[PDB]
């Protein structure tokens, strides 16, 4: 059984306010 | 009308009193409580909302004497006004700059 496939190519979504 | 202190907890010397305020909530209660607590003449402060579904607010100030909760509340409100004024003036100056 191979593990759950990984959603690759994921970037950083949460930037602090004003950023 | 909007502001009426409760005779049930007021004192003849006036040093302790409880105010019931309409159409108010934390938005004024917390700031006023902070400002009044900044007065070293008073001992007790803090605010309580009787029931959330009713637009009511209670402020109780127990001084240490020589003063009144009435004048302590007046002083707190005036300090609130001055604090808002300094915030506004600094904001406007930084807008200019």
């Amino acid at each position: 059984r191979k593990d759950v496939p990984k959603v690759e190519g994921l970037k950083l979504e949460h930037f602090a306010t004003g950023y | 009308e909007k502001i009426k202190l409760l005779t049930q907890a007021t004192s003849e010397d006036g040093t302790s009193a409880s105010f019931q305020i309409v159409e108010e909530d934390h938005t004024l209660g917390n700031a006023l409580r902070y400002v009044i607590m900044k007065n070293p003449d008073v001992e007790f402060c803090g605010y309580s909302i009787p029931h959330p579904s009713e637009n009511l607010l209670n402020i109780r100030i127990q001084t240490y004497g020589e003063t009144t909760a009435v004048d302590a509340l007046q002083k707190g409100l005036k300090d609130l006004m001055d604090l808002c004024d300094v915030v506004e003036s600094k904001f406007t100056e930084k807008i200019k700059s």
Binding site: - | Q8, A9, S18, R33, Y34, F44, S48, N58, R60
Partner: protein, 192 residues
């Protein structure tokens, strides 16, 4: 008026603190007030002058009859230098002092709760609560002292001042652990 006076004296919810099934208590705060008590009465929790006074006034409101001295009374702060701090146990103590009728000794109570000493670490004595003269001095408040458990602080307040004062203590602690839990909220998640 016959039925009004009937329901107001024989069947009203305060006059039924315990059940005649076994004489054990049936009333008391249930889940979130209990979990907030384990935090406010924890030894690690201190509260400044403003936070303490705010909690006490919001819990009590003398204008609504929760007091007995026609003016809220206070307590000495635990800490004097560098700055005046209080404790949660002092908060419970002054809450009792404000609801409990004056000129009456406080509940000198000895009992325990549902929390073993080894959970708090070595040398801890929090398993037992040591009330005195209307003051909490050791251990923590818990379900065992308010809820579906016997020989608690509210049970002894019942046993000493009738069921009315115990009812008012239930109400006052309900308004105390509520306004408290707004400020320091309680949650759970995958990390737990």
């Amino acid at each position: 008026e016959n039925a009004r006076a009937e329901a107001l004296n024989l069947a009203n919810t305060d006059s039924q603190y315990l059940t005649p099934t076994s004489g054990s208590p049936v009333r008391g705060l249930i889940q979130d007030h209990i979990s907030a008590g384990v935090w406010l009465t924890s030894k690690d929790s201190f509260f400044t002058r403003e936070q303490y006074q705010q909690y006490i006034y919001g819990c009590i409101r003398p204008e609504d009859g929760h007091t007995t001295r026609s003016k809220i009374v206070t307590l000495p702060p635990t800490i004097f230098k560098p700055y005046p701090l209080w404790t949660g146990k002092q908060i419970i103590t002054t809450v009792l002092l404000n609801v409990t009728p004056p000129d009456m000794p406080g509940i000198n109570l000895i009992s325990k709760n549902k929390i073993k000493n080894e959970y708090w670490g070595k040398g801890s004595l929090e398993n037992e609560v040591l009330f005195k003269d209307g003051a909490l001095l050791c251990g923590i408040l818990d379900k065992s002292q308010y809820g579906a458990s016997k020989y608690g602080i509210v049970h002894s307040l019942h046993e000493v001042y009738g069921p009315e004062v115990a009812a008012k203590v239930l109400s006052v602690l309900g308004r105390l652990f509520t306004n408290y839990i707004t400020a320091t909220a309680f949650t759970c998640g995958m990390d737990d």
